Amino acid sequence: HGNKGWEAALSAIEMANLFKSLRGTGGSGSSMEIYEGKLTAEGLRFGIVASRFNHALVDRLVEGAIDCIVRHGGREEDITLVRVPGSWEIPVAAGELARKEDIDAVIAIGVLIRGATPHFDYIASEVSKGLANLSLELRKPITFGVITA
Amino acid sequence: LEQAIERAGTKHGNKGWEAALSAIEMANLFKSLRGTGGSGSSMEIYEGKLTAEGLRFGIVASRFNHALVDRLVEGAIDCIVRHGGREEDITLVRVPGSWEIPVAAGELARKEDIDAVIAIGVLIRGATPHFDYIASEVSKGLANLSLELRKPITFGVITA
Amino acid sequence: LEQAIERAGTKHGNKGWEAALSAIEMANLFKSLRGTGGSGSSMEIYEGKLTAEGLRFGIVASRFNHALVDRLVEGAIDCIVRHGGREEDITLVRVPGSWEIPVAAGELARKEDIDAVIAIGVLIRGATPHFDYIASEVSKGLANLSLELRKPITFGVITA
Amino acid sequence: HGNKGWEAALSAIEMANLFKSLRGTGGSGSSMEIYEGKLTAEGLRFGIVASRFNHALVDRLVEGAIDCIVRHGGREEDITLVRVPGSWEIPVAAGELARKEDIDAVIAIGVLIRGATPHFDYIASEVSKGLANLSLELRKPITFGVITA
Amino acid sequence: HGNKGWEAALSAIEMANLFKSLRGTGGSGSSMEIYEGKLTAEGLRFGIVASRFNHALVDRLVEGAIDCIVRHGGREEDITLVRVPGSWEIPVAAGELARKEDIDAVIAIGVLIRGATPHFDYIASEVSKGLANLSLELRKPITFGVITA
Amino acid sequence: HGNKGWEAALSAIEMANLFKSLRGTGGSGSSMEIYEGKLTAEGLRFGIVASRFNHALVDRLVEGAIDCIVRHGGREEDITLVRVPGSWEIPVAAGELARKEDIDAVIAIGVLIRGATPHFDYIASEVSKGLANLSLELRKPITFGVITA
Amino acid sequence: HGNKGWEAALSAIEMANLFKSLRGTGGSGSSMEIYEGKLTAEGLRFGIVASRFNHALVDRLVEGAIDCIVRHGGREEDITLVRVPGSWEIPVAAGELARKEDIDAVIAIGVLIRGATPHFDYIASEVSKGLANLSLELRKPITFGVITA
């Protein structure tokens, strides 16, 4: 409920609904047009990409994601799960799910080593950079569920 | 005599072995997503196989600290053959230094008869106040190539 | 709903996975020694492959603490299919308790169309002053069967 | 039902069925073959070996073993009982019963004294080691009903 | 030189030579017949079975074994090496090398966990027991090069 | 096996068989007709009613009841479970399950507190009196799994 | 919260929903059809019968019953309260209230002060015995929340 898996799922549902309204027909006007996202999950298609490093922690995060979607009227048939060896492959794996026209949002869940002993962690910066660029290029929401040790 | 000692060493858990194992799973996973689909009525889980038969690979490795790089290369080749791969379906490319691994990686990845690329190198003196501009470019460059070409690239350098 | 949670769990490093991986390598190693031989002029190294295609297996598992044993069984089956094995070539046998795993193991190993046997069980209260006569018999019995029949038997119980 | 005798009979009955299934002709195939032992005790001939030390306790255990076989469809005519002067003679007598082609399982019932001595009871080890060895040589289940005290 | 790998190899060379003389023709007599083994390794065939657990320690032990044999006139073409996943498989692997009529001795090299927290280590006792029995049954020397942590 | 839950299942299974035998056509005759209940649990649909007071103890009993039915040939799909806030509601819920034409027996599992008071527990008497009365009116066995403490 | 009025009301809530599900359509099948009730009070009509002897204690008890219904999302308009001279009249009064086609549950509250003497065992027994028979005949839950004293 309070785990980072829950939080990532909530952002996905809101964002998916928001993009539905914007592409719809505009209103008559006469007032400021306020746009906002709903928390209803009916009729949506979702995809989750997760890793295996420290599978103890990652396992419970994925459980949270599935619970949140179904509890908000999400049908189990509309979840596609993909597993990758490690964090380095999350962005490339998320590329193929996003391009599919069936999916509406992608949730990325993972975990990264504490590190902090070197000046910079080069490997840990490409996962964040890669996902952000993919969202703008493909015009689809991608959520960052990565925990840090 | 010294040849026997070198051969006696194990090559089951070195960074090269891990890099090749990650490549085989990703290559098989891609061929599954791009193909057909299931019936339905349940959550659909995708996970790659560990079968290396029928897949063609490409390995790019540098030379600086060739004593350490050479064994990392043997680990990767050993993994492919053990898991059923065919020796005839491997391409090895050697480059001078780490600055110019990504340029070679792109040329291999652009071929229509390659499935994954394993990149092997060594980084020297990672703990230094000066920003290692060379080091950050190798990591950044390989990542961008993977997304553009929609082909996995594995990155198994060892710090030093 | 609860079915999804159970399926979401990973089965990559459990004791069952390790037991099945050890069996595949040993079975392939045996088919190499018993066959042909090399030319010579160098030290001859024998090492098994990790290809599970064409091999028939047999798994024996108990019931006490069936909640834990069941997932260990899934790990072993998952390893075989991932490494290229065929689901049709597996035989599962279930037994009441740990005292009588070895008796079932012998019957499977004596078939001419089985290559290795994976044994899965649970041992309870290993730290006790009384000599667990049941526990020592399971370990001793499986070992003797392996040597007599010249066939590998893997032993992947988990203490508790 | 909570006595060790009832437990011993159940184990023997369903291994007798498992072995009958294994050595028979295989099924159609095309899927994983799973083998299990039913609790039907029709046409199964049993033998029981029982000691006499602390004859009071051992007496009720033997009743449980016979009771279980009759309830589960067993014919009373197909049970053979043997009595031995003590624990040490159980392995020797059990082997004599096992070699008979008109037997499908054997149940060993006995009581062992407390091993308060620093050295493990040599007699205690041999009976466990003997019964186990017999099962492998003759390929026939031999259940273990020894109860400590 | 002083590592346990060296010591195991030395015993193998002596034992292999000893069995050569015993099967030879007997002497005239007139005095006590003293038999003893030589340290000459020419013309012999050797086999080594090693594991991978803690491959750092095991690797140097295997290096010692090869050095000792070659330094005593051992040709490199007459060594066969077999690797197994773990300690549990040493006895069964050593079974196949021994039966081959080409080999004259088998050296077993390995390493076992410190343990000592339970009352007994069941897994660590079968490797020792298995190798000893195999030597008597097959009538061939097998050396125990297992280190303990 | 020694828990009251295993005992309750056995009683229910073999009355379900007895009633199936009685209402069927009679035998040839010419001798005394003796009716008995087999332990085969094929094609028998069961219902279980379980309380929640002291949920720890009641939890393991229900596992025994389900375990017994599957071992004796029962299909897991043919069991219906109902949970009630306490002991007082067992008779009322049991009657609802009993009237279904797709049920052949019912098992009542519960725990009752000690009757240390001088007056007998009125709640304790009613559940025994209620379940017994139901069996006669509806002509369907209702096993009694209540365990005192 | 800590008064028997609390518990009686809480139990009634669970039982009301439980019966609604059972009479309704079953589940998708293919597994154990576990049934259970929730604490959703909305949409339910209740009724309370409370005595008048020792109104001091009874008054607070009936107040506790009110708190559950309003607190758990039950309208204050559906509660129906009926008062009677004493404990002897609770059964017959509850029968009339229960038989109404709208009242979906009933609660009883009282104090059996005279239970300290065996002479009251006659009147004491009937009230608990009577309410039990009402529920079975009419097939509708009737909670029993009296206090002994």
Find the closest chain E residue to B10 by CA distance: E55
CA distances from E67 to B95, D6, E11, E70 (A): 36, 63, 14, 5
SS (H, E, C) B62-116: CCCCHHHHHHHHHHHHHHHHHCCCCHHHEEEEECCCHHHCHHHHHHHHCCCCCCE
Q: Which amino acid is at D38?
A: K
Name every residue whose Cβ is closer than 8 Å to that of residue A61 and which is 6 or more positions away in sequence: A3, A4, A5, A50, A109, A111, A145, A147
Write the Ramachandran bin of G30: left for phi over 0, alpha for psi from -120 to 50, otherwise beta: left
Q: Which residues from chain D sit within 8 angstroms of residue C99, using beta carbons?
A: 144
Distance (Å) from the alpha carbon of D37 to chain F's nearest alpha carbon: 9
CB-nearest to C1 from A52, A70, A81 is: A70
**Quick check: do E and B touch, 3+ CB pairs under 8 A?**
yes
Q: Which residues from chain E sit within 8 angstroms of residue C118, using beta carbons?
A: none
Q: Which residues from chain B sit within 8 angstroms of residue A51, using beta carbons?
A: none
* Main-chain phi, psi angles of C63, to 5 degrees: -125, -30
CA geometry: angle at C9 spanning C5 and C13, to 5°? 170
CA distances from G25 to C1, C53, E121, F137, G41 (A): 20, 48, 58, 26, 21
- A66 vs C5: CB contact, 8 Å cut-off? yes
**Quick check: do G and B touch, 3+ CB pairs under 8 A?**
no
Q: Which amino acid is at F109?
A: I
- B9 vs E59: CB contact, 8 Å cut-off? yes
Contact, F44 vs F77, CB < 8 A?
A: no
Asked if residue C154 belongs to a known ligand binding site, the reply is: no
Instruction: Choose the catalytic residue: E1, E55, E72, E119.
Output: E119
- The DSSP element (H or E) to which D100 belongs, if any, is none
Q: Tell the residue number behind the tokens 């529920």, with chain if given.
A: G135
CA-based nearest residue to C43, from G27, G44, E48, G58? E48
Name every residue whose Cβ is closer than 8 Å to that of residue B14 and which is 6 or more positions away in sequence: B71, B72, B75
Q: Which residues from chain C sit within 8 angstroms of residue D147, using beta carbons?
A: none
CB-nearest to E77 from C33, C42, C129 is: C42
- F122 vs G121: CB contact, 8 Å cut-off? no
Distance (Å) from the alpha carbon of C84 to chain B's nearest alpha carbon: 6
Nearest-angstrom CA–CA distance, F47 and G34: 10
- The DSSP element (H or E) to which G118 belongs, if any, is none
CB-nearest to A52 from C1, C4, C12 is: C12
Name every residue whose Cβ is closer than 8 Å to that of residue B33 and which is 6 or more positions away in sequence: A82, A96, A97, B46
Contact, G126 vs G91, CB < 8 A?
A: yes
Cβ atoms within 10 Å, residue A84: 26
- Cβ-based interface (< 8 Å): residues of G facing F: 10-11, 14-15, 18-19, 22, 29-36, 115, 121, 124-125, 128-129, 132, 135-136, 139, 141-144, 148
Name every residue whose Cβ is closer than 8 Å to that of residue A32 and which is 6 or more positions away in sequence: none
Q: Which residues from chain E sit within 8 angstroms of residue C44, using beta carbons?
A: 79-81
Contact, E52 vs B10, CB < 8 A?
A: yes
CA-based nearest residue to A52, from B22, B120, B154, B151? B22
Nearest-angstrom CA–CA distance, B13 and E52: 10
- C84 vs B49: CB contact, 8 Å cut-off? yes
Q: Which residues from chain C sit within 8 angstroms of residue D33, using beta carbons?
A: 90-92
3-state secondary structure at position F44: coil
**What is the 8-class DSSP label of residue F29?**
-
CA-based nearest residue to B151, from B58, B37, B76, B74? B58
Asked if residue E87 belongs to a known ligand binding site, the reply is: yes
Name every residue whose Cβ is closer than 8 Å to that of residue A58 and which is 6 or more positions away in sequence: A50, A51, A52, A109, A110, A111
CB-nearest to D15 from C88, C100, C102 is: C100
Nearest-angstrom CA–CA distance, G87 and D44: 64
Classify residue B16 as exposed, middle or buried by CB count within 10 Å of its CB (0-12, 13-18, 19+). buried
Nearest-angstrom CA–CA distance, B144 and E35: 74
Distance (Å) from the alpha carbon of C91 to chain A's nearest alpha carbon: 28
CA geometry: angle at A88 spanning A84 and A91, to 5°? 80
Q: Which amino acid is at F81?
A: L
Distance (Å) from the alpha carbon of D121 to chain C's nearest alpha carbon: 10
Contact, F139 vs F20, CB < 8 A?
A: no
Give the determination technique: cryo-EM
Classify residue F48 as exposed, middle or buried by CB count within 10 Å of its CB (0-12, 13-18, 19+). buried
- A63 vs C12: CB contact, 8 Å cut-off? no
CB pairs under 8 A between B and E: 21
Nearest-angstrom CA–CA distance, C29 and A52: 30
Distance (Å) from the alpha carbon of E5 to chain B's nearest alpha carbon: 14
For testing the chain A interface, which of B46, B101, B151 should be mutated: the one with the most A CBs within 10 Å? B46
* Main-chain phi, psi angles of F83, to 5 degrees: -125, 140
- Side by side, the strands of the sheet bearing D142-148 are D79-83, D46-50, D105-112, D142-148
Asked if residue B114 belongs to a known ligand binding site, the reply is: no
Strands, E, within chain G: which ranges? 48-50, 81-83, 106-109, 111-112, 142-144, 147-148
* Main-chain phi, psi angles of G22, to 5 degrees: -60, -45
**What is the 8-class DSSP label of residue E89?**
G
Structure tokens that stand for G55 in this block: 């109104």
Name every residue whose Cβ is closer than 8 Å to that of residue A117 and which is 6 or more positions away in sequence: none
Nearest-angstrom CA–CA distance, D45 and D69: 10
Instruction: Write the DSSP string, chain A.
Output: --SHHHHHHHHHHHHHHHHHHHTSPP---SS----------TT--EEEEE--TTHHHHHHHHHHHHHHHHHTT--GGGEEEEE-SSGGGHHHHHHHHHHSSS--EEEEEEEE----SSS--HHHHHHHHHHHHHHHHHT--EEEEEEE-
3-state secondary structure at position D83: strand
| DSSP-assigned beta bridge partners for residue C44 | E80
Nearest-angstrom CA–CA distance, A54 and A111: 7
Give chains near E: 3+ CB pairs under 8 A. B, C
Structure tokens that stand for C132 in this block: 């667990």
Burial G111-121 (b: 16+ CB within 10 A, else e): bbeebeeeeee
Asked if residue D46 belongs to a known ligand binding site, the reply is: no
Alpha helices, DSSP H, located in chain E: 4-22, 55-71, 90-99, 122-138
- B82 vs C4: CB contact, 8 Å cut-off? no
CA-based nearest residue to C49, from B78, E48, E79? B78
Asked if residue C14 belongs to a known ligand binding site, the reply is: no
- Side by side, the strands of the sheet bearing G81-83 are G81-83, G48-50, G106-109, G142-144
Asked if residue E6 belongs to a known ligand binding site, the reply is: no
Q: What does DSSP say about strands E46-50 and E105-112: parallel, antiparallel, or unpaired?
A: parallel
Resolution in A: 3.1
CB pairs under 8 A between C and D: 69
Nearest-angstrom CA–CA distance, A80 and A59: 16
For testing the chain C interface, which of A48, A53, A62, A78 should be mutated: the one with the most C CBs within 10 Å? A62
Q: Which residues from chain B sit within 8 angstroms of residue C50, using beta carbons?
A: 50, 82-83
CA-based nearest residue to C108, from C57, C62, C73, C53? C57
Q: Which residues from chain E sit within 8 angstroms of residue B10, using beta carbons?
A: 52, 55, 59, 83
Asked if residue C123 belongs to a known ligand binding site, the reply is: yes
- C84 vs B43: CB contact, 8 Å cut-off? no
Please say if C66 is a catalytic residue. Answer: no
